[PDB]
Design an enzyme around this catalytic site. Structure first.
Site, PDB file in Angstrom:
ATOM      1  CG  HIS A   1      -0.179   0.255   2.562  1.00 43.63           C
ATOM      2  ND1 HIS A   1       0.298  -0.761   3.287  1.00 43.63           N
ATOM      3  CD2 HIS A   1       0.145   1.435   3.266  1.00 43.63           C
ATOM      4  CE1 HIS A   1       0.936  -0.301   4.395  1.00 43.63           C
ATOM      5  NE2 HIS A   1       0.845   1.060   4.385  1.00 43.63           N
TER       6      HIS A   1
ATOM      7  CG  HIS B   1       6.383  11.407  -9.894  1.00 42.29           C
ATOM      8  ND1 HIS B   1       7.462  12.031 -10.444  1.00 42.29           N
ATOM      9  CD2 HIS B   1       6.187  10.241 -10.650  1.00 42.29           C
ATOM     10  CE1 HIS B   1       7.960  11.305 -11.471  1.00 42.29           C
ATOM     11  NE2 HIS B   1       7.206  10.190 -11.594  1.00 42.29           N
TER      12      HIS B   1
ATOM     13  CD  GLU C   1       4.746  11.652 -13.460  1.00 45.74           C
ATOM     14  OE1 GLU C   1       5.571  12.528 -13.186  1.00 45.74           O
ATOM     15  OE2 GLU C   1       4.975  10.709 -14.229  1.00 45.74           O
TER      16      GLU C   1
END
Lengths: 125, 119
Positions: B8, B62, B101
């Site tokens: 996770h 990211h 993204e």
């Protein structure tokens, strides 16, 4: 029809590529796939990890089997990795190891799944 | 001896209600649990855990998600029409500035720059 499909990759900024390669590929046993001048990519746990070299509000957790818990715990210690404390009995009951990479990005190894957490556990949907 | 899979991802967030609307409604994730202070989602096959920390002050990480290339316009418009911070590919942040993204091809395809060293 209208869903994000899967994780494409995760990316970390790191101060020293060679140090991070040793961490993600040698210690964590990922596969180095490509490098550039300031860039490295790995496959790890079925995930693509991109590191971009650049000289506590997020963490990433990977699944391991119960039966590999003590293997991991000791591999991290034998490699002098920075290990952080988890919940009471996370180590004795082989639940979780928390640690950081060389740049301090927080990582965890966990032997449970999401259903295990849900069952162990508040408002359920 | 291998890590088997991602388990996770956990994100700190300033306002849990804003983050729930972001993750469940804009991004169409599935809300599983709340407590606290906490919400769990399944999004794109991934457990996402949010921990509310209301006094948060974001550039060094990211997470990128794969979408159907035929859905690029759908997603680009969905994010725009929902006033999402937006920066082939869509680069954007959540309400707290966590970098996300969307891409319409896998990182492996993309990688398939002569000077790069391929293993």
């Amino acid at each position: 029809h209208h869903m994000l499909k899967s994780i494409n990759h995760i990316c970390f900024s790191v101060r020293n590529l060679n140090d991070s390669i040793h961490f993600y590929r040698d210690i964590l046993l990922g596969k180095l796939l490509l490098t550039g001048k300031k860039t490295a990519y790995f496959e790890l746990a079925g995930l693509w990890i991109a590191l971009n070299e650049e000289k506590s509000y997020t963490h990433i957790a990977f699944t391991i089997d119960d039966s590999e818990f003590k293997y991991w715990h000791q591999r991290l210690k034998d490699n002098n990795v920075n290990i952080l404390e988890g919940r009471v009995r996370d180590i004795r009951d082989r639940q979780s190891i928390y640690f950081t990479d060389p740049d301090g990005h927080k990582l965890e190894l966990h032997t449970g799944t999401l259903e295990n957490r849900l069952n162990y556990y508040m408002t359920f949907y």
